[PDB]
């Protein structure tokens, strides 16, 4: 028979910047705070062993 | 946790400046006043220390 593999799909890598407060344009100021963003997006991993 | 800090605020600076007597162009006499103005307005103080 054909070989039989486990579709597999990697985790999302994410990463955190932390903010300084600032002042914006319209003089509100903005305590320190977090973004987040993903850097590299999860993906199939093929497979190392067919069989 | 991010850190917190709290916003401050300045204090405006005033400047008053003394009138001495005067006559305009309609001819009535004007006695001795003030009249004040703000040269540094308030504005928010950035932290010197976010922890």
């Known amino acids: 028979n054909p070989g039989t593999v486990h ?4 985790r999302d890598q994410i990463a955190t910047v932390w903010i300084a407060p600032w002042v914006d ?3 509100a100021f903005h305590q320190p705070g977090r973004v987040s963003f993903v850097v590299s997006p ?6 190392a062993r067919v069989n």
């Open 42 to 47: 999860a993906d199939w991993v093929l497979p």
């Open 7 to 10: 579709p597999q799909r990697s």
């Open 25 to 27: 344009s319209d003089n």
